[PDB]
Amino acid sequence: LPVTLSALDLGALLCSRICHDIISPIGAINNGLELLEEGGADEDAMALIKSSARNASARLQFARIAFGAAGSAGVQIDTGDAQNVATEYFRNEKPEFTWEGARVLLPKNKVKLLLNMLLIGNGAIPRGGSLAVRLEGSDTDPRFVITVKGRMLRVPPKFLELHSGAAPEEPIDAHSVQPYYTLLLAEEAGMKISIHATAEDIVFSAE
């Protein structure tokens, strides 16, 4: 709302964000190969390569739908696909992850909004906890509810800032592009995000 990125700058920052998120697991694959060649712990090295490749794959498949155009011809996305890539993604994240709600075809940007709200939620519990998703409403008027609980509970400051309609203090970059993008998707989809924060939990909801 208060700031806008050019097509070139949005695309570049989203690409940087995806790259940033896979540097470590792809690096660990290379580390595993180095350990394997050094010998003495071949099983550990292979296990590392396996889990790091699974991590990289999960992040790429999630990005394919949350940031990319995948799962769509376009126009619609199957929330069953969204549930699958989200569940595998959170296998490599701290919170205990649950998903509730009927499998449904929805406009692509509404499902992309949903997946991006998971990332905001994850950011709100940086010391872990639980992230629970509920799909509610109708297929014409969906409602997404993302509820997080954990020892550290805080609305991500950049998201709070942008969502309140305030221009950012520093330029949008590969970190802040994701909350910017989340709000952009909500605007595009004609949906409004609400934040309800208590001492027990934070609920991010959209409708």
Where does this chain bind Na ion (CB under 5 A)?
54, 58, 88, 91-92
Residue 104 interacts with a copy of itself (CB under 8 A)?
no
Least Cα distance to 65 among 109, 124, 23 occurs for 109
Select the binding partner of residue 19 from Na ion, a copy of itself, none (C-beta < 5 to 8 A, by kind): a copy of itself
State phi, psi for 134 to the nearest 5 degrees: -125, 130
Residues in the chain: 207
CB of 50 to Na ion, least distance (A): 11
Which of 70, 105, 160, 203: binder of a copy of itself (CB under 8 A)?
A: 70
State how far the Cα of 70 lies from the Cα of 15, in Å rounded to an integer: 15
Residue 48 interacts with a copy of itself (CB under 8 A)?
no
Residue 181 interacts with a copy of itself (CB under 8 A)?
yes
Residue 168 interacts with a copy of itself (CB under 8 A)?
no
Which CB atom, from 20 or from 192, has the smaller least distance to a copy of itself? 20
Select the binding partner of residue 46 from a copy of itself, Na ion, none (C-beta < 5 to 8 A, by kind): a copy of itself
- Start-to-end CA distance of the chain, whole Å, equals 17
Select the binding partner of residue 157 from Na ion, a copy of itself, none (C-beta < 5 to 8 A, by kind): none
Which of 48, 82, 145, 185: binder of a copy of itself (CB under 8 A)?
A: 185
Select the binding partner of residue 159 from a copy of itself, Na ion, none (C-beta < 5 to 8 A, by kind): none
Which CB atom, from 25 or from 142, has the smaller least distance to a copy of itself? 25
Residue 54 interacts with a copy of itself (CB under 8 A)?
yes
Residue 206 interacts with a copy of itself (CB under 8 A)?
no
- Are the beta carbons of 111 and 82 closer than 8 angstroms? yes
Residue 91 interacts with a copy of itself (CB under 8 A)?
no
State how far the Cα of 148 lies from the Cα of 150, in Å rounded to an integer: 7
Which of 50, 91, 103, 127: binder of a copy of itself (CB under 8 A)?
A: 50
Which of 3, 9, 38, 100: binder of a copy of itself (CB under 8 A)?
A: 9
HSE-up of 158 (CA within 13 Å, CB side)?
A: 19
